[PDB]
């Protein structure tokens, strides 16, 4: 089973947003207390309609700063890395983290012959 | 009698009157000042003045600005000026002059302004 601060994903489901954020670190909890962006709120409307089935579009996003909550778990969202929308599928273990962490934007650098 | 002493930035105002011998720095007794080297600088002039002049007059000196060495030097300056004015004797004047010219002249040395090319380190320091 998956546990977050001594609670499971379904246990995390029923917690209010304030109590839920109390489990988050200071950065994420304070970001939530300061209020999501209006664009973040539009994305929340999108993902919530998707989880109810009404929203059937392959869901994209630019909000790299959108902090993953337990309610995003189990959905595929495509975050803009700067050039395209890299896809990510939300496992339960990303509770307490930002979207941009899992949207790579810099490619791998390897070393060849010096000029 | 009033006297003045300037050292770098520190300024010491000294007042001398007839008294037992109590000497105070900022209202503090002379023998208790923690930096011993500064205690010796402050004690330097009246050593050569003599215990009679020491025990014939009371002195209060109040110093502001500069550091503790500068403050002690300013008090040393003001003490000598106060003594030579109170007694009005040239013998001890030449005694101090012989021991140290700055005793009654003083050091007009001042810090030069810092200049560019890594100004933080001084007027003359530069980069490598």
């Amino acid at each position: 089973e998956f546990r977050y601060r001594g609670y499971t994903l379904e246990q995390l489901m029923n917690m209010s947003l304030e109590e839920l954020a109390r489990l988050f670190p200071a950065r994420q909890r304070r970001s939530l207390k300061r209020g999501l962006t209006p664009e973040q709120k539009k994305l929340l409307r999108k993902i919530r309609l998707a989880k109810k089935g009404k929203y059937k579009k392959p869901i994209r996003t630019h909000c790299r700063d959108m902090i993953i909550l337990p309610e995003m778990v189990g959905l595929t969202i495509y975050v803009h890395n700067g050039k395209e929308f890299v896809p990510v599928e939300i496992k339960p273990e990303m509770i307490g983290h930002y979207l941009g962490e899992f949207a790579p934007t810099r490619k791998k650098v390897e070393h060849g012959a010096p000029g | 009698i009033q006297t003045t002493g300037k050292r770098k930035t520190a300024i010491a105002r000294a007042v001398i009157r007839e008294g037992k011998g109590r000497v105070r720095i900022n209202g503090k007794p002379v023998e208790i000042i923690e930096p011993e080297i500064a205690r010796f600088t402050i004690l330097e002039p009246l050593i050569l003045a003599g215990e009679e002049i020491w025990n014939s007059v009371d002195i209060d000196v109040k110093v502001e600005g500069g550091g503790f060495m500068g403050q002690a030097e300013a008090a040393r300056m003001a003490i000598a000026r106060a003594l030579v004015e109170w007694t009005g004797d040239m013998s001890l004047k030449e005694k101090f002059m012989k021991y140290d010219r700055t005793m009654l002249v003083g050091d007009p040395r001042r810090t030069e302004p810092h200049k560019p090319n890594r100004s933080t380190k001084g007027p003359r320091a530069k980069r490598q």
Binding site: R5, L23, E93, H97, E101 | -
Partner: protein, 131 residues
């Protein structure tokens, strides 16, 4: 006692107890000082006179620091990820905790996990010349 074993880790008796406890990983000088104060003992005494009941007292302090008077903010992992509880980890538990955090950052495919995979600096250090 020139040798004193506490919580499965040996310490020199010549060092003072606040200095002796430092040899254990998971304990710094400040942690040693506060646990010594919890014991109500002098921080400066030689560890080589540690009669065993004090060893057990320090041990059960390690087991649950919070209930012994230590606040919630002197532990190494406050609000533990799988219990919600502020716990002071030690030795193999600490290694397993950091290891699990590493594989968690890797599994989520975060940038921190990527750096731990490639053995690169995490916190934005400039590496064009450095490292």
């Amino acid at each position: 006692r020139h040798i004193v074993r506490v919580a499965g880790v040996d310490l020199d008796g010549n060092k003072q107890l606040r200095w002796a406890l430092t040899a254990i990983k998971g304990i710094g000088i400040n942690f040693a000082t506060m646990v010594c104060r919890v014991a109500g003992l002098d921080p400066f005494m030689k560890a080589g006179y540690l009669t065993d009941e004090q060893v057990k007292k320090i041990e059960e302090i390690l087991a649950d620091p919070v209930a012994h008077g230590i606040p919630r903010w002197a532990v190494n992992r406050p609000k533990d990820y799988e219990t919600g509880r502020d716990l002071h980890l030690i030795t193999a538990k600490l290694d397993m905790a950091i290891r699990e955090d590493i594989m968690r950052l890797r599994r989520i495919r975060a940038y921190r996990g990527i750096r731990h995979e490639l053995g690169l600096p995490v916190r934005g250090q400039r590496t064009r010349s450095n490292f």
